[PDB]
């Protein structure tokens, strides 16, 4: 369809063996927790996934115990809410998608767990969308609950612009400029959509080193066992 | 199987042991000339279909864009 | 030439050298490879 195509940004993980910047993933998780978690869900990400990536065991335990999670039927036979555990997943904003429709003027905020993977050119798109709430031009008019984001399909995203400069304060203190926040949350969402990005690239580096060792050696063995024929000299000697 | 495959006569066939001969005799010495020899016997049969695929692909893209580009005369 | 006559000519020894080498190769490869990956990122 007719849509603005987000440009290519020089990400720190854009390279072939380039891993993710984990401080940026920590800052983007803070951005999600303070801003994006009010409407969007992360159903396939738990707190224990943050251990060894952005936070330690005790920091992630404190982060999990900051929230409340209904957990099981009491012996008395009823529900109850408990502080989150490292095994708890990220809390739902709404109990069901129809509540999300009712609370967001008919629009459904999608799962942001795989948003980067699910959106064509996601990392860019995300950054662009979050930073692309430009004014609608003449000739186009949008109804309430809509915003002209060139990048968003149709340029009418129900989501209002969620990142105002200094929307939240980074604990690290890095200036919380809108951009610094959009880049951090794009790195984090990326991490979310692929927690193994780093581990894999290490496997790929070992694979390239092993193939660079093994391909000329197997080629040399093949050319040994095929030299015999490749030197064979045929001669026709009719008895004449 | 072997032994009953074919009937040849008076065709002597000499050969050498693998360990007795260089592994890559003149590999880049003649390999390059040969690879180049090869490419010039097949390039005229292979390449021009893919060249006109590239032209048709670009053309389609650009034509499509122009198609999408608003008609200035229209709406005025 | 000595090596061939010692660890590469008898197939049993050929296997021995292979297995033993592989046992250590992993240590070296992993170590070296990791160094590189870390340096890169």
């Amino acid at each position: 369809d007719l849509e603005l195509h987000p440009p290519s940004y020089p990400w720190s993980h854009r390279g072939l063996l380039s891993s993710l910047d984990h401080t940026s993933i920590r800052r983007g998780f803070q951005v999600y927790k303070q801003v994006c978690s009010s409407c969007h869900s992360m159903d396939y990400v738990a707190y224990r996934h943050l251990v060894g990536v952005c936070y330690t065991e005790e920091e992630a335990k404190a982060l999990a115990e900051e929230v409340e999670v209904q957990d099981g039927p009491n012996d008395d036979g009823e529900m109850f809410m408990r502080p989150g555990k490292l095994s708890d997943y990220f809390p739902k904003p709404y109990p069901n998608p129809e509540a999300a429709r009712a609370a967001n003027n008919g629009a459904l905020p999608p799962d942001l767990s795989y948003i980067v993977r699910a959106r064509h050119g996601g990392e860019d798109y995300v950054f662009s969308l979050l930073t692309g709430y430009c004014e609608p031009p003449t000739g186009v008019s949008l109804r309430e609950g809509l915003y002209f984001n060139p990048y968003f399909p149709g340029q009418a995203i129900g989501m209002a612009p969620p990142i105002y400069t200094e929307v939240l304060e980074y604990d690290d203190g890095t200036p919380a400029t809108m951009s610094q926040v959009a880049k951090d949350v794009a790195t984090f969402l990326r991490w979310a959509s692929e927690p193994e990005h780093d581990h894999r690239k290490r496997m790929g580096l070992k694979m390239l080193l092993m193939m660079g060792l093994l391909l000329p050696l197997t080629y040399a063995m093949k050319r040994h066992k095929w030299s015999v024929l490749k030197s064979r000299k045929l001669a026709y000697r009719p008895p004449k | 199987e072997f032994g009953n495959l074919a009937r040849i006569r008076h065709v002597i066939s000499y050969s050498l042991s693998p360990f007795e001969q260089r592994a890559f005799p003149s590999y880049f010495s003649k390999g390059i000339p040969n690879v180049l020899r090869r490419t010039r016997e097949r390039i005229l049969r292979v390449a021009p279909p893919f060249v006109v695929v590239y032209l048709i692909y670009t053309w389609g893209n650009q034509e499509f864009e122009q198609s999408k580009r608003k008609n200035p005369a229209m709406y005025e | 030439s000595r090596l061939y006559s010692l660890l590469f000519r008898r197939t049993s020894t050929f296997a021995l050298t292979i297995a033993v080498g592989a046992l250590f190769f992993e240590r070296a490869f992993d170590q070296g490879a990791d160094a590189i990956y870390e340096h890169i990122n």
Binding site: S227, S231, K233, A235, R237 | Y14, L16, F19, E20, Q21, R22, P25, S26 | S1, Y4, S5
Partner: peptide, 24 residues
């Protein structure tokens, strides 16, 4: 007969002596 010709030259193939065989 079988002696009219000699084995063709493999010099461009042959490497450049049991002494060496062990290494080879």
């Amino acid at each position: 007969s079988h002696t009219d010709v000699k084995v063709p030259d493999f010099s461009d193939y042959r490497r450049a002596s049991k002494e060496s065989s062990e290494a080879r």
